[PDB]
Amino acid sequence: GGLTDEAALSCCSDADPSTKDFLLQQTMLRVKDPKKSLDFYTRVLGMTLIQKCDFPIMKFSLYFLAYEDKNDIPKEKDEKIAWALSRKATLELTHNWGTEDDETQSYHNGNSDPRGFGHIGIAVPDVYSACKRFEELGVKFVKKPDDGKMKGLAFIQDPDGYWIEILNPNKMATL
Amino acid sequence: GGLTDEAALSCCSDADPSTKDFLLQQTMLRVKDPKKSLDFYTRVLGMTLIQKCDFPIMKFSLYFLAYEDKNDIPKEKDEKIAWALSRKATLELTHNWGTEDDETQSYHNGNSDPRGFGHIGIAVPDVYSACKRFEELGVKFVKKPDDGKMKGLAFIQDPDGYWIEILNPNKMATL
Numbered sequence: 575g576g577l578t579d580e581a582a583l584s585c586c587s588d589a590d591p592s593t594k595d596f597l598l599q600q601t602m603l604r605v606k607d608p609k610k611s612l613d614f615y616t617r618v619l620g621m622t623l624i625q626k627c628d629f630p631i632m633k634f635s636l637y638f639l640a641y642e643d644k645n646d647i648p649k650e651k652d653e654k655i656a657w658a659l660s661r662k663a664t665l666e667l668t669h670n671w672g673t674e675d676d677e678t679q680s681y682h683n684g685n686s687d688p689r690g691f692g693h694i695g696i697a698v699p700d701v702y703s704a705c706k707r708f709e710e711l712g713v714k715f716v717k718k719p720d721d722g723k724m725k726g727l728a729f730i731q732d733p734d735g736y737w738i739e740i741l742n743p744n745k746m747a748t749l
Numbered sequence: 750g751g752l753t754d755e756a757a758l759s760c761c762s763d764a765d766p767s768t769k770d771f772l773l774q775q776t777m778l779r780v781k782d783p784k785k786s787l788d789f790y791t792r793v794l795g796m797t798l799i800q801k802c803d804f805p806i807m808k809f810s811l812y813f814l815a816y817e818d819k820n821d822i823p824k825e826k827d828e829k830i831a832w833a834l835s836r837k838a839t840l841e842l843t844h845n846w847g848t849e850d851d852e853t854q855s856y857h858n859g860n861s862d863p864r865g866f867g868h869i870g871i872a873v874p875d876v877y878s879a880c881k882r883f884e885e886l887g888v889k890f891v892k893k894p895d896d897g898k899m900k901g902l903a904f905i906q907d908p909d910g911y912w913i914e915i916l917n918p919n920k921m922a923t924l
């Protein structure tokens with residue numbers, strides 16, 4: 575029947591002082607077509623592109639998306655890499671050059687065999703008003719807010735099929 | 750050849766004001782055995798368990814891990830859920846009850862065919878000292894910091910085999 579609260583807490587250790595400056599900086603997803611991914615994350619979800627890195631020998635690019643004010647992004651390049659990579663809660667999109675032209679190619683979202691990664695999730699002030707807008711924009715849904723057993727929580731998908739949870743923190747208690 | 754900077758930026762839109770309070774709240778990974786996972790993320794990586802939710806008819810639990818001070822966690826149950834689910838940069842582990850006792854079951858890390866998800870990543874003050882400690886604690890490595898081409902960057906594995914990048918934002922520019 576799973577762990578009890580107390581049993582779970584018994585498995586948790588206090589943070590060693592050597593970890594006290596650590597932060598959860600990024601979640602990396604591979605994307606077939608960065609043009610479509612950038613449009614989605616910025617126009618649909620309101621993220622900002624904060625950094626782009628290109629590796630021509632390895633034939634890939636990295637795009638770092640975050641909820642940050644574009645006016646805070648440093649102008650000077652070294653400062654800009656160090657700032658972008660010290661922001662909490664970034665999304666790192668990895669583009670292996672040439673996938674966008676390969677009709678047979680797609681990435682796997684983790685929610686079918688083989689399962690592992692599930693989703694990123696965005697906390698919004700109002701899941702219903704968010705989802706109405708997503709519907710107006712033609713966003714793909716896995717689960718509408720009222721569909722299924724978990725009313726008031728939604729799942730959409732990005733251009734690659736990755737699932738994104740849309741959740742309201744302030745309603746999850748009174749729900 | 751991958752996108753030019755100009756081409757990438759032209760795919761980006763400004764944040765619609767409907768999205769102005771959105772935040773990247775969680776990354777969700779499925780875990781075989783929450784006992785080992787809680788021990789890893791708290792003892793090894795210095796995260797705090799901030800919330801745990803159980804669903805006894807659906808037979809799964811959710812564990813929310815973050816770099817937060819345990820003294821900040823609200824005492825009142827409903828306030829704690831609202832606080833936990835409005836923290837940026839949480840890691841949500843999902844445990845389907847029973848997997849820990851099924852020797853034919855395991856999750857996929859996304860880095861072998863079919864690929865998709867890559868890794869989460871932790872920013873640290875000192876990759877090499879962090880990794881020396883990891884080695885002392887018997888952590889499994891995908892890439893030690895001096896291995897391979899990108900010297901000074903590491904990848905460890907959690908108990909499920911998910912990859913965790915260990916990076917120092919200040920050393921990433923100069924390299």
Ligand SMILES: COc1c(/C=C/C(=O)c2ccc(O)cc2)ccc(O)c1O
Pocket residue numbers: 692695724727739741746775777807809811834841843845
């Ligand atoms: C998993 O993500 C969530 C969920 C749960 C939603 C799920 O997608 C889910 C994952 C595994 C499973 O076996 C059943 C359902 C519920 C509340 C919440 O806040 C949250 O973030």
Ligand SMILES: COc1c(/C=C\C(=O)c2ccc(O)cc2)ccc(O)c1O
Pocket residue numbers: 600602636659666668867870891892897899902904914916921
């Ligand atoms: C994909 O994540 C990155 C990379 C990108 C990838 C790698 O450097 C890499 C090296 C060895 C390996 O086994 C797997 C991947 C480079 C810089 C950076 O900051 C970052 O976050």
Ligand SMILES: N[C@@H](CCC(=O)N[C@@H](CS)C(=O)NCC(=O)O)C(=O)O
Pocket residue numbers: 715716717722724729
């Ligand atoms: N809370 C559920 C909701 C997801 C859902 O409704 N699942 C279906 C709806 S599209 C799905 O993933 N595919 C199987 C189906 O169509 O029955 C979750 O864990 O994501």
Ligand SMILES: [Zn+2]
Pocket residue numbers: 600602666868870914
């Ligand atoms: Zn990375």
Ligand SMILES: [Zn+2]
Pocket residue numbers: 693695739775777841
């Ligand atoms: Zn979730």
